[PDB]
Design an enzyme around this catalytic site. Sequence first.
Site, PDB file in Angstrom:
ATOM      1  N   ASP A 179     -20.554 -34.686   3.766  1.00 58.20           N
ATOM      2  CA  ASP A 179     -19.910 -33.723   4.010  1.00 58.20           C
ATOM      3  C   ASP A 179     -18.774 -34.423   4.987  1.00 58.20           C
ATOM      4  OD1 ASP A 179     -19.037 -31.962   6.071  1.00 58.20           O
ATOM      5  OD2 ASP A 179     -20.899 -31.771   7.286  1.00 58.20           O
ATOM      6  N   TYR A 233      -9.839 -35.268   9.046  1.00 58.48           N
ATOM      7  CA  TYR A 233     -11.248 -34.034   9.003  1.00 58.48           C
ATOM      8  C   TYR A 233     -11.818 -35.843   8.203  1.00 58.48           C
ATOM      9  CZ  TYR A 233     -13.674 -30.719   8.147  1.00 58.48           C
ATOM     10  OH  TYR A 233     -14.205 -29.932   8.394  1.00 58.48           O
ATOM     11  N   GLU A 292     -13.862 -30.030  13.424  1.00 59.20           N
ATOM     12  CA  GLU A 292     -15.093 -28.176  13.501  1.00 59.20           C
ATOM     13  C   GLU A 292     -15.299 -28.409  15.189  1.00 59.20           C
ATOM     14  OE1 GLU A 292     -15.418 -27.477  10.952  1.00 59.20           O
ATOM     15  OE2 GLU A 292     -13.957 -28.531  10.515  1.00 59.20           O
ATOM     16  N   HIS A 343     -19.155 -31.612   9.528  1.00 55.53           N
ATOM     17  CA  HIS A 343     -19.663 -29.802   9.669  1.00 55.53           C
ATOM     18  C   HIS A 343     -21.202 -30.024  10.588  1.00 55.53           C
ATOM     19  CE1 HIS A 343     -17.438 -29.030   6.779  1.00 55.53           C
ATOM     20  NE2 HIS A 343     -17.196 -27.765   7.417  1.00 55.53           N
ATOM     21  N   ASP A 356     -14.135 -14.844  14.468  1.00 59.70           N
ATOM     22  CA  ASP A 356     -14.527 -16.652  15.120  1.00 59.70           C
ATOM     23  C   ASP A 356     -13.816 -16.771  13.893  1.00 59.70           C
ATOM     24  OD1 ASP A 356     -17.205 -15.536  13.743  1.00 59.70           O
ATOM     25  OD2 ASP A 356     -18.355 -16.738  15.268  1.00 59.70           O
ATOM     26  N   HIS A 374     -11.300 -19.629  13.868  1.00 63.50           N
ATOM     27  CA  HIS A 374     -11.988 -21.425  14.240  1.00 63.50           C
ATOM     28  C   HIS A 374     -11.141 -21.547  12.905  1.00 63.50           C
ATOM     29  CE1 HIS A 374     -14.514 -24.254  12.818  1.00 63.50           C
ATOM     30  NE2 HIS A 374     -14.136 -24.280  11.327  1.00 63.50           N
ATOM     31  N   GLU A 375     -10.072 -20.882  12.116  1.00 62.96           N
ATOM     32  CA  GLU A 375      -9.336 -21.853  10.918  1.00 62.96           C
ATOM     33  C   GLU A 375      -8.509 -21.663  11.529  1.00 62.96           C
ATOM     34  OE1 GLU A 375     -10.201 -23.373   7.966  1.00 62.96           O
ATOM     35  OE2 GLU A 375     -12.438 -22.526   8.487  1.00 62.96           O
ATOM     36  N   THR A 399     -25.599 -14.079   5.628  1.00 61.71           N
ATOM     37  CA  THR A 399     -26.671 -13.288   5.239  1.00 61.71           C
ATOM     38  C   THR A 399     -26.377 -11.689   5.697  1.00 61.71           C
ATOM     39  OG1 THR A 399     -28.178 -14.349   7.200  1.00 61.71           O
ATOM     40  CG2 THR A 399     -27.142 -15.372   4.435  1.00 61.71           C
ATOM     41  N   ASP A 441       0.702  -1.240  -0.246  1.00 64.95           N
ATOM     42  CA  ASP A 441       0.063  -0.235   0.016  1.00 64.95           C
ATOM     43  C   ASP A 441       0.533   0.700   0.539  1.00 64.95           C
ATOM     44  OD1 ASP A 441      -2.857   1.043   0.594  1.00 64.95           O
ATOM     45  OD2 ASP A 441      -1.413   2.721   2.166  1.00 64.95           O
ATOM     46  N   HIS A 485      -7.362 -24.992  13.433  1.00 58.62           N
ATOM     47  CA  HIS A 485      -7.129 -26.545  12.332  1.00 58.62           C
ATOM     48  C   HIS A 485      -6.056 -26.312  12.457  1.00 58.62           C
ATOM     49  CE1 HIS A 485     -11.192 -27.885  11.625  1.00 58.62           C
ATOM     50  NE2 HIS A 485     -11.338 -26.592  10.773  1.00 58.62           N
TER      51      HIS A 485
END
Length: 316
Positions: free
Chosen positions: A226, A157, A166, A231, A138, A142-143, A194, A57, A146
């Site tokens: 899944d 997984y 998870e 999940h 979150d 969360h990621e 959403t 930047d 992992h």
Amino acid sequence: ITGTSTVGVGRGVLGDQKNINTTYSTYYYLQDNTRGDGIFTYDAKYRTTLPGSLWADADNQFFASYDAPAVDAHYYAGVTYDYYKNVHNRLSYDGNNAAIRSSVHYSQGYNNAFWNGSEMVYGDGDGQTFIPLSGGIDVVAHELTHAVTDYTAGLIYQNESGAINEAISDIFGTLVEFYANKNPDWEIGEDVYTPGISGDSLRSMSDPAKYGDPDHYSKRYTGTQDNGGVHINSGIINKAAYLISQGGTHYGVSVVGIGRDKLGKIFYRALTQYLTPTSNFSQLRAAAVQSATDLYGSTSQEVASVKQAFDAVGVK
Ligand SMILES: [Ca+2]
Ligand SMILES: [Ca+2]
Ligand SMILES: [Ca+2]
Ligand SMILES: [Ca+2]
Ligand SMILES: [Zn+2]
């Protein structure tokens, strides 16, 4: 890059203003030299090639709308690193200060974010289902959890070990959200999911059945979708962790809560000392009970509450 450490300012996905650690060397880069071996944020420029270019930047001010997801990816990876260091004494995800890299603007209209084994990747969302996923602290925590799991228990997984994988990510993403005191709750992804509907989220830890996930072992998904329901079946463990923390009566079984702090200490200990790649739910219960026993004594209330929580979700 080699340069001088400095501090820039910008706005995140939600419009909030924050200071971020950057590096100057001709351009100002999203490179934070104050944490471990560094936190680096890249621009994937709507492509799927990774990592893309280290974010540069010209004036150290990040108020463009294209800048927003980079600001929050960079800043929330710094808050997650701080949580693990200050609360659990762990330096980065490998425990030896590994560098944390994240790319934003991955692909076009991509409704997801993930740890790929080497770095974080975030989509911008399609604008209807999600807005840029790095705006959710979150989700980011969360990621990044992992990555911790990969370096410690190594849970595969799929099937029950993936659902444990998870749930551990939901639990610690939630604890990070409480540690940053960012309007905290027990739901996942409510800040970025959403934009047009208020009050919902991807998943709920306090009442997983609100979105259709199982809250009891007799309701577990047994098919193949899944990766065997990683999940979906994580709702059973999320509900147990919520009860351990907060208390409650679930399918007629009463649990006295012991609080978030002890919840985090018991699960962190179970994850780093007793879980293995193929642990199932029954082995998680034993690990959590043993952890609570190590930390508080076999005749503590803490041990008692862990047992009642797993009993309430039907895990023996
Ligand atoms: Ca600028
Ligand atoms: Ca929240
Ligand atoms: Ca949340
Ligand atoms: Ca919403
Ligand atoms: Zn996950």
